[PDB]
Amino acid sequence: TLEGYYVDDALQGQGVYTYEDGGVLQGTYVDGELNGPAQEYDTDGRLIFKGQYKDNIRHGVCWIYYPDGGSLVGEVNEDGEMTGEKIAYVYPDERTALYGKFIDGEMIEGKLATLMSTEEGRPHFELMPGNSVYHFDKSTSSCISTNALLPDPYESERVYVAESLISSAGEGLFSKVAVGPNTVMSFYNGVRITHQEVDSRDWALNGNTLSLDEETVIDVPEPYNHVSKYCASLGHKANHSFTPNCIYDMFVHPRFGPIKCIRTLRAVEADEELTVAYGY
Numbered sequence: 281t282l283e284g285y286y287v288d289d290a291l292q293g294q295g296v297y298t299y300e301d302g303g304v305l306q307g308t309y310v311d312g313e314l315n316g317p318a319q320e321y322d323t324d325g326r327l328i329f330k331g332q333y334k335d336n337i338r339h340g341v342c343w344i345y346y347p348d349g350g351s352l353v354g355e356v357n358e359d360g361e362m363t364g365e366k367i368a369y370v371y372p373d374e375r376t377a378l379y380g381k382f383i384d385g386e387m388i389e390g391k392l393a394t395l396m397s398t399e400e401g402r403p404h405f406e407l408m409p410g411n412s413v414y415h416f417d418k419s420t421s422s423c424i425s426t427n428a429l430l431p432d433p434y435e436s437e438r439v440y441v442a443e444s445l446i447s448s449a450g451e452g453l454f455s456k457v458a459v460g461p462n463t464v465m466s467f468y469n470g471v472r473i474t475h476q477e478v479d480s481r482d483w484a485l486n487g488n489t490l491s492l493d494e495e496t497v498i499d500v501p502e503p504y505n506h507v508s509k510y511c512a513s514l515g516h517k518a519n520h521s522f523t524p525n526c527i528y529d530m531f532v533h534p535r536f537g538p539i540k541c542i543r544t545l546r547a548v549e550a551d552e553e554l555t556v557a558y559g560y
């Protein structure tokens with residue numbers, strides 16, 4: 281088959297679609313509509329969906345994987361949307377998860393949990409003990425967080441703040457455990473401000489600004505650069521080096537929203553200081 285895109289077989293059964301852009305989609309078909317097991321991949325070989333369809337709407341328990349390694353899994357609603365009471369955002373280690381109430385893939389109330397096993401397609405989670413509820417809480421131009429002192433579950437296991445070993449750098453960010461290359465370790469969340477705002481005020485104030493996109497800049501200003509005032513995320517604590525063990529990369533966070541992460545470039549040691557090359 282060929283439309284300027286591409287499709288594979290006669291009536292129905294199990295076929296593959298490919299878009300004007302390289303990305304595949306493996307579906308099982310029934311009368312030309314999708315019904316059954318599907319898996320879609322990225323223009324780059326990356327699994328971005330696994331799960332199933334019924335009358336061309338996503339059905340059942342489906343996995344959506346972001347490029348950063350994080351994922352969303354749950355039984356979808358009648359419209360195929362990630363809305364329900366038993367949905368989870370799962371972190372890049374594929375084990376820590378925030379389970380619970382989500383609207384449209386957005387988190388209303390997520391409880392710390394662990395994904396013990398995918399038995400079939402379905403996954404089994406188990407709640408972790410503790411009072412901790414997490415909520416979608418994107419920061420604004422003036423509110424860095426609705427709960428500045430609730431740490432991020434994933435971060436508090438892989439990293440910590442302490443005196444820098446670098447010459448005169450105040451504090452730094454340390455790895456807590458040994459990790460191999462390409463590992464997310466910490467989140468860089470702050471108030472969202474505009475490039476012009478950052479370009480026009482005294483520059484002596486952009487020590488913690490980090491550009492998100494062509495329109496937005498994340499900053500960790502005011503007194504939130506002190507951990508007794510803010511510790512939700514710890515990214516703004518990594519110091520600079522010309523030969524870093526880490527890189528800034530994009531991240532889709534369930535509490536923070538579109539932000540950056542600190543990801544490792546090589547294996548790193550427990551207790552090793554984490555660095556990135558500032559300014560890209």
Ligand SMILES: Nc1ncnc2c1ncn2[C@@H]1O[C@H](CSCC[C@H](N)C(=O)O)[C@@H](O)[C@H]1O
Nearest residue numbers: 446448449450451487516517518519520521
């Ligand atoms: N290689 C380096 N040498 C000296 N200061 C550094 C540095 N990398 C980062 N810094 C200080 O770290 C800043 C980035 S924010 C990283 C955290 C910071 N040192 C703190 O104590 O909160 C810059 O303002 C620079 O002053």
